[PDB]
Symmetry: C2
């Protein structure tokens, strides 16, 4: 969704610490390789964008959800989120557990 | 821009540690204020979205740029970005300097 779309009521920023750029690439390939095809149609899911940090040390997911309730019901409470967590944890080169920050959009600036 | 817009070549995620929700509001108000309208016209600027962490302790800016040079030079060499940085660093309630992570979008999971 557009970053400022009013439907975005809840965001998670998840950082995965990795051992370098080869693992960054493998982790994004894994995350977008079909393991989470099921999430796409879940109610309230808007997007998950995986980024490689320029310094090679982390993959960062910016995830948009319609609301915290939708995230909790349709993601956190579905055992498939634990299967997805297991899959992403399986990759050689992941150096520690992912770190999450939960937040809500409060203001934006777009080009004129 | 949409999170998977192909023009987004570079993202900065900047986290400002703050002492509580009153400060989260003052910081977003300052950052989205009005005298800061010049950013909207910077070449290569795509968006800045400010978020309040649900726990009250941080404001997070997810910023989209066409390239690292648009952020570093088109924005960062402009004297106005030094003025903005000083205003944000002098706000009461800040608990430490902002921390930035720089990254490149590499994949996205979206609904059909």
């Amino acid at each position: 969704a557009e970053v400022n779309d009013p439907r975005v009521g809840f965001v998670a920023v998840v950082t995965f610490p990795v051992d370098g750029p080869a693992t960054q690439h493998k982790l994004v390939e894994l995350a977008t390789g079909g393991v989470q095809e099921w999430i796409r149609e879940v109610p309230g899911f808007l997007s998950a964008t995986y980024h490689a940090s320029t310094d090679g040390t982390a993959v960062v997911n910016y995830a948009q959800w319609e609301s915290e309730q939708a995230y909790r019901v349709n993601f956190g409470a579905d055992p498939r989120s634990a299967e997805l967590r297991e899959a992403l944890s399986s990759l050689p080169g992941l150096m520690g557990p992912p770190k999450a920050v939960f937040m809500t959009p409060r203001g934006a600036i777009l080009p004129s």
